[PDB]
Amino acid sequence: MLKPNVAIIVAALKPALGIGYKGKMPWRLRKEIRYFKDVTTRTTKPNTRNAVIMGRKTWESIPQKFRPLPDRLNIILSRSYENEIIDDNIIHASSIESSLNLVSDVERVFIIGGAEIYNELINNSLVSHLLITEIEHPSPESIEMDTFLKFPLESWTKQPKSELQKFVGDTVLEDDIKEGDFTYNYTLWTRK
Ligand SMILES: NC(=O)C1=CN([C@@H]2O[C@H](COP(=O)(O)OP(=O)(O)OC[C@H]3O[C@@H](n4cnc5c(N)ncnc54)[C@H](OP(=O)(O)O)[C@@H]3O)[C@@H](O)[C@H]2O)C=CC1
Ligand SMILES: Nc1nc(N)c2c(Sc3ccccc3)cccc2n1
């Protein structure tokens, strides 16, 4: 696949954009997880699949029995990896672009984390869309976190919900989803 448009998908707590704590997510939002699954799995084309790219640490955080993520091509990046097709569902690579040369029959490509991956790859011009779940809590500074996005949001434009809906197609998009003390909304951003 030559120069595909790639999207980052992440859930972050406002206003600091915290995303993790000691290798884990700082919340368990059941509905958000199902949205993640639907968005990264759904395709429009016939014999296609989407690809999900992640850093080695994120991969290793999934219990062995639950990896690869089903129904998507999984790509794992490590600076130590050779560019290798493991099986039909798993690819090893040392760079995003290199990994994409190994794929065919992919519709969309999503970067799913983690922090190092996100913070590096946001500056790669292949990245054209950000799908950010914006989480809010009454006392954000009560939720322990050690990992944050460092995204140059002044160079991006948040689109109206209508553009998000068009991006996700079928997927039901509820507003102001509340779970425990957290309230969240899905957003789409594109480059200025
Ligand atoms: N809130 C959310 O939506 C999400 C949050 N997260 C959170 O992120 C945190 C984990 O992030 P982090 O620890 O940074 O791990 P990552 O998943 O980002 O993995 C980092 C590893 O990826 C490899 N890597 C990183 N950058 C590159 C690059 N540019 N090219 C090639 N290989 C690269 C390296 O592997 P090697 O060392 O082998 O070279 C590096 O050690 C956790 O707290 C997790 O919960 C994760 C996903 C979503
Ligand atoms: N919006 C969004 N973005 C992601 N990247 C998510 C991920 S990615 C992940 C995959 C395996 C292990 C840890 C995180 C997991 C759960 C919910 C997620 N929500």
Side-chain angles (χ1 to χ4, degrees), residues 1-21 23-44 46-104 106-192:
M1 180 160 284
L2 170 64
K3 305 296 178 178
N5 297 325
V6 335
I8 281 166
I9 178 158
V10 61
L13 184 63
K14 292 209 301 179
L17 310 184
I19 66 165
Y21 186 72
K24 57 53 180 248
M25 294 168 69
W27 49 72
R28 189 231 326 185
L29 308 171
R30 295 168 287 165
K31 291 171 84 148
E32 210 286 325
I33 306 301
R34 192 164 293 107
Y35 165 82
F36 166 78
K37 162 189 65 57
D38 284 346
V39 180
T40 63
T41 304
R42 76 168 289 333
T43 59
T44 299
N47 295 233
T48 67
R49 322 186 266 186
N50 295 324
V52 290
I53 302 177
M54 70 196 101
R56 187 186 53 70
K57 293 179 177 52
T58 296
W59 174 252
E60 293 182 347
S61 80
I62 306 166
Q64 72 181 58
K65 331 80 214 161
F66 320 122
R67 71 201 194 212
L69 296 181
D71 299 318
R72 287 148 289 182
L73 174 58
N74 295 217
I75 298 166
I76 305 96
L77 302 179
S78 167
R79 279 170 296 228
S80 280
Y81 296 162
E82 293 308 313
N83 302 310
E84 176 173 4
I85 290 158
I86 296 204
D87 63 23
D88 204 52
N89 296 313
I90 301 160
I91 291 172
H92 270 200
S94 53
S95 76
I96 181 167
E97 212 171 341
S98 289
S99 78
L100 294 167
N101 283 313
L102 286 333
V103 319
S104 57
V106 163
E107 190 173 285
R108 283 176 170 164
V109 175
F110 294 98
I111 288 163
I112 72 162
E116 191 183 341
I117 293 286
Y118 291 135
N119 292 327
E120 214 102 273
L121 304 171
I122 186 59
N123 299 307
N124 184 313
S125 62
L126 290 181
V127 181
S128 59
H129 295 80
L130 314 178
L131 286 176
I132 302 163
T133 297
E134 296 192 323
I135 308 172
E136 291 169 278
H137 185 282
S139 198
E141 65 320 79
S142 68
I143 303 137
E144 308 320 344
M145 58 204 173
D146 65 356
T147 310
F148 301 90
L149 299 183
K150 26 175 259 201
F151 293 184
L153 299 173
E154 31 317 82
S155 289
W156 287 82
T157 303
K158 177 193 266 189
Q159 294 301 135
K161 192 181 194 189
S162 54
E163 287 295 306
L164 172 59
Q165 186 74 71
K166 286 163 53 187
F167 189 100
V168 303
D170 263 315
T171 320
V172 172
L173 299 180
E174 280 186 301
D175 301 312
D176 302 313
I177 308 166
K178 183 67 157 195
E179 285 194 58
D181 293 302
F182 299 104
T183 310
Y184 59 92
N185 289 101
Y186 305 122
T187 67
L188 172 69
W189 299 68
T190 58
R191 288 184 184 277
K192 45 199 80 174

